[PDB]
RNA sequence: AGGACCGAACCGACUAAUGAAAAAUUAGCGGAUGACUUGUGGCUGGGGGUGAAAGGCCAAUCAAACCGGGAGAUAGCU
RNA sequence: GCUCGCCGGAAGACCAAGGGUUCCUGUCCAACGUUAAUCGGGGCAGGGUGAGUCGACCCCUAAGGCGAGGCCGAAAGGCGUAGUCGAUGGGAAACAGGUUAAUAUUCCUGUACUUGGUGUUACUGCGAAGGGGGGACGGAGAAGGCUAUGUUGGCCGGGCGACGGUUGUCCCGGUUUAAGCGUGUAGGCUGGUUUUCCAGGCAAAUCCGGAAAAUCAAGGCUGAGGCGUGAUGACGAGGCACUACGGUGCUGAAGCAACAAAUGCCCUGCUUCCAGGAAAAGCCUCUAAGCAUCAGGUAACAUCAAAUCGUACCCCAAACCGACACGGUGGUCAGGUAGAGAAUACCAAGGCGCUUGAGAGAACUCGGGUGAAGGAACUAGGCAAAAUGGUGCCGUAACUUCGGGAGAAGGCACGCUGAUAUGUAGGUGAGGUCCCUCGCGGAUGGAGCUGAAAUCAGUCGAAGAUACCAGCUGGCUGCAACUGUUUAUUAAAAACACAGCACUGUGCAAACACGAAAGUGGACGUAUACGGUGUGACGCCUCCCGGUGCCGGAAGGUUAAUU
């Protein structure tokens, strides 16, 4: 049982990319940016409540931040957690 | 028996094996085993405290019974076994009550021989009893110095002690060194000589053998530079000084016993 | 030719890392000194 | 069987000629089941360690490591 | 794109360590790249790392670390008990195919497995900080059984030749398929089952150990591979539709047999040797306190569960350690022909041509090739080159510690073809036939397959161990017995070490060593042991105690604090 408030905080965004699109189309799997602390179960819960859609399974991974250079000064982008969430057969997501 | 090995290579030429067939060809009694890791002759500070120790073969520790307290229960000798931890051979015995122990194998002992500890026990080889009960003139081994402690004198492959006298609460032992020593007469002792008496006839026959026995090589002080040893330095081979340890103390002759607490027990020093 | 530095992360950490430094008084002192100096990377710790 | 033999890997470094290289090259050379070799981790600390002993080795530094301090040592010398 | 060349026990493929975006795409060429650069590991932007079963975490411990109390220490702190950490070791579980520009045992497809809860019905002794078993272990050697893998034939598809021949004993390609589940084999280990008692296993034990007694000779454990299923599937040479020339979608034959065969597996086995070969948990089992008709245990079945972190890419290197796009770096994989071979040569798969080129064809330098006659005259020195170089057989001195010396030396044979023998000796081994406690069984049988070595006869060349590969040999002699070790980076030796020898200390709270100490090493050793010193295999051997040391003595002389 995850708290409503917690759930709302978990899910950061949808991730747009070719791969993501492919996943959505073929495998019925949505690619989300989620909180770095968000566990799989929590993510699933969030998905179910907040998008109103049955979840088969969630795979997560941590994306490491790229090191960049703004002019002369070096600086690193933040790490962030990506989640492939596979929706059950016949579940169409808006 | 001793066996001079045929010189099919140098390093085998001068080898003499001591091959006893009556030893157990097999894995030892595992309950009585325990771990025994190597020091490298280095103490808790991590410094080398005794030179020339290092390496050699992994060895288990056989838990030998030197206290020898199963009084009245007769044991029977199951087998003789190789112990890597000592010059003697050990013997796995089986008490009538079902317990097993390792003991130093004495001279005549073999599989099937019955042995017994206690005041009542028969004065025969391998039997153990207090030195007040043991007849004067007898050869004993595995001799306790303090009653109850465990055998400390005469444990090595072909050693034994003579009980020369029993004067009241003490008995006088003629130790293998030639030292005559008073010992409390209630101290325990095992009848006969300890076993593996042709141990001294073995000759390693190569450098490697020594190494296998965990003995690193020994450099001569005279081969060193003066900063290292008192004997060091000299152009060519010089040695114009009285022999001494690496720490400058005389080596040829200078006595080093300082124990004034046990001077009373020493009847006569060895010669 | 086998050069002197042959990196190993665990070894580095155990040797020089924060916790090691903390463990002893001299280590602590070193840390303090570093802090005083204004070091950004107080220890080898990543 | 063997600190046995011939010989690749592997470990070494006797001869030779020759910066890519703050010790290498190519051609040969020694050991190659052992007192062998190697990975990972551990321990020994500076008049201290370790040393099959050459004053060798202890982070390209060693008849006393490196870093900071006494310290602007002292310099009848340049 | 087509040729050419190089690596191929790597200059290929996959990891660890280390790095940390170098990966992929688009875009830009100032700088960086030893030249140019449209290219890049460079700049900028975007994308990319998907796990119950791989690894970490986790449970367990080794060396070692920390260490409540504690012992010790001016202070700081040292050592260490209980404990708790610490992998490089032990501990549950996944395979095949398909897919991305870039991930995959992680996605998808198929087919699996694991150990937890929870609930069940069925049963009914459960229970640990304790007991026992197990885990649990060395070197070498030898086979035998296997597979990986390869070769040939069969089969299936395609081919009929740019130049003489090529419808055949011809040519090219393919002929692949897992874990799991079932079977429990080659083979290895052990005698089982029941009963009774017992000073043992810190207490108890129905467990282990020990005694008896009965009865049956098969009982159990282990075990590669094969076979079956998994699989009416998947993959499949290439054909066929579309084409953003990148590829996408459909489709799909055969898919067998024999022989050879590992250094891999059975094997943590067996045999043997002495130098005598981790630990703890998981796992099995036994009970105690306990609880007692409850919990807990095992039984299947249902359901839920398996979080977290790593996953790109380089990894013998242009990405790690070397200031560089410059030598070092642990593991795994190991095709063909020749060969003893992981050597060597040429090749496969795959990967590269080393980020300045173009000419010229002087001296001189480097790295190679050949050389008349002579053959060490060179030189400090045959330094360097040259030479020797294989298998089999014959043959082989002094001296010797009887092992050696010895590959001593020195010689002969060596290709191809045919025959012996349309392929032998051997190896393997199908049908058939017989037996049978029935199976992965035993006999007999020899088809097919594979296949040396030799002899005889012929034959070609200047030359048959034809290339690469691959000892130079002998004689006298110093030193060190020997194998070893050593000055990282001018010294590898006659130096150090060595087995052996001798002296000497040391009676165990050992001498000695590291420690203001506690303590630790010596050693869980005990004089056949340990320390120190010298000598240095083996053989034959090996006067002086005045000096300096050490050992013993203590009559006298001298002699401190103290008084």
Report domain extents, chain B: 1-113, 117-194, 195-271
Nearest residue, CA→C1' of E538: B14
b/e for A53-74, b at 16 or more Cβ within 10 A?
Answer: bebeebeeeeeeeeeeeeeeee
Structure-determination approach: cryo-EM
What is the phi/psi pair of residue B117, to 5°? Answer: -105, 160
In chain B, DSSP assigns E strands to: 2-4, 16-18, 33-34, 61-62, 74-81, 90-95, 100-104, 114-116, 128-130, 139-141, 161-167, 170-174, 180-184, 188-191, 266-268
Find, among A6, A92, A18, A19, the residue nearest to A49 by Cα.
Answer: A6
Counted residue by residue, chain A has a size of: 94
* Maximal C-alpha separation, chain C: 40
Lookup: nucleotide whose C1' is closest to A19 CA: E100
- DSSP label at residue B148: T
Tokens of B240: 């114009």
H or E segment and range at residue A58:
strand A55-63
H or E segment and range at residue A43:
helix A40-51
Subunits close to C (at least 3 CB pairs below 8 A): none
In angstroms, the Cα distances linking B208 to B38, B87, B271 are 18, 19, 35
D strand bases under 7 Å from protein CB:
1-4, 21, 23-24, 34-36, 40-45, 49-55, 59-60, 63-64
Beta strand pairing call for A11-14 and A29-34: antiparallel
Angle at B54 between CA B48 and CA B58, to 5 degrees: 135
Lookup: nucleotide whose C1' is closest to B207 CA: E498
Beta strand pairing call for B61-62 and B33-34: antiparallel
SS3 category, B133:
coil
- Residue in the structure block whose two tokens are 């390693």: B204
Angle at B62 between CA B192 and CA B86, to 5 degrees: 55
C-alpha span between B155 and C4 (Å, rounded) = 51
C-alpha span between B101 and A79 (Å, rounded) = 65
SS3 category, B209:
helix
Tokens of B261: 């607490």
SS3 category, B150:
coil
Structural domain range at position A24: 2-94
Rounded, the Å distance between the CA of C26 and C1' of E87 is: 29
Q: How many domains does chain A have?
A: 1
Instruction: Please state, as a whole number, how many other Cβ atoms lie within 10 Å of the Cβ of residue B91.
Output: 27
C-alpha span between B221 and B230 (Å, rounded) = 7
Beta strand pairing call for B188-191 and B170-174: unpaired
In angstroms, the Cα distances linking B210 to A13, B53, B84 are 73, 10, 14
Q: How many domains does chain C have?
A: 1
**Domain CATH code at residue C31:** 1.10.287.3980
Dihedral Cα C15, C16, C18, C22, nearest 10 deg: 70
Residue A33 and residue A63 in contact, taking contact as beta carbons nearer than 8 Å: no
- Residue in the structure block whose two tokens are 């019925």: A28
SS3 category, B60:
coil
Question: What class, spelled out in words, does domain B195-271 have in CATH?
Answer: few secondary structures
Tokens of B31: 């309950």
Residue A4 and residue A45 in contact, taking contact as beta carbons nearer than 8 Å: no
Asked whether residue B227's C-beta has any atom of DNA/RNA strand D within 7 A, the reply is yes
Structural domain range at position C20: 1-46
Subunits close to B (at least 3 CB pairs below 8 A): none
Rounded, the Å distance between the CA of B253 and C1' of E502 is: 14
**Domain at B1-113: CATH code:** 2.40.50.140
C-alpha span between B161 and B194 (Å, rounded) = 10
C-alpha span between B163 and B182 (Å, rounded) = 10
C-alpha span between B175 and B270 (Å, rounded) = 9
Rounded, the Å distance between the CA of B78 and C1' of E29 is: 89
Lookup: nucleotide whose C1' is closest to B40 CA: E521
């Amino acid at each position: 049982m995850i708290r409503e408030e917690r759930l709302l905080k978990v899910l950061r965004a949808p991730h747009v990319s070719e791969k993501a699109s492919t996943a959505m189309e073929k495998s019925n799997t949505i690619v989300l940016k989620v909180a770095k602390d968000a566990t799989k179960a929590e993510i699933k819960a969030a998905v179910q409540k907040l998008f109103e859609v049955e979840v088969e399974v969630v795979n997560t991974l941590v994306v490491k931040g790229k090191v960049k250079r703004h002019g002369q000064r070096i600086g690193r982008r933040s790490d962030w957690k990506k989640a492939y969430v596979t929706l059950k057969e016949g579940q169409n997501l808006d | 028996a001793v066996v001079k090995c045929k010189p099919t290579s140098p390093g085998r030429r001068h080898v003499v094996k001591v091959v006893n067939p009556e030893l157990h060809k097999g894995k030892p009694f595992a309950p009585l085993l325990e771990k025994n890791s190597k020091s490298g002759g280095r103490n808790n500070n991590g410094r080398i405290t005794t030179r020339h120790i290092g390496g050699g073969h992994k060895q288990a520790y056989r838990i030998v019974d030197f206290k020898r307290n199963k009084d009245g229960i007769p044991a029977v000798v199951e087998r003789l076994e190789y112990d890597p931890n000592r010059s003697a051979n050990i013997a796995l015995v089986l008490y009538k009550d079902g317990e097993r122990r390792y003991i130093l194998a004495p001279k005549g002992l073999k599989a099937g021989d019955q042995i017994q500890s206690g005041v009542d026990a028969a004065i025969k080889p391998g039997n153990t009893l207090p030195m007040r009960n043991i007849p004067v003139g007898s050869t004993v081994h595995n001799v306790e110095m303090k009653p109850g402690k465990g055998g400390q004198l005469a444990r090595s492959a072909g050693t034994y002690v003579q009980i020369v006298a029993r004067d009241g609460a003490y008995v006088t032992l003629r130790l293998r060194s030639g030292e005559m020593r008073k010992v409390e007469a209630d101290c325990r002792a095992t009848l006969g000589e300890v076993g593996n008496a042709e141990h001294m006839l073995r000759v390693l026959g190569k450098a490697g053998a020594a190494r296998w026995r965990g003995v690193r090589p020994t450099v001569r002080g005279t081969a060193m530079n003066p900063v290292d040893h008192p004997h060091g330095g000299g152009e060519g081979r010089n040695f114009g000084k009285h022999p001494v340890t690496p720490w400058g103390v005389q080596t040829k002759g200078k006595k080093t016993r300082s124990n004034k607490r046990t001077d009373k027990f020493i009847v006569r020093r060895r010669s | 030719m086998k050069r002197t530095f042959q990196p190993s992360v665990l070894k580095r950490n155990r040797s020089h890392g924060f916790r090691a430094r903390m463990a002893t008084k001299n280590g602590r002192q070193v840390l303090a000194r570093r802090r005083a100096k204004g070091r950004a990377r107080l220890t080898v710790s990543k």
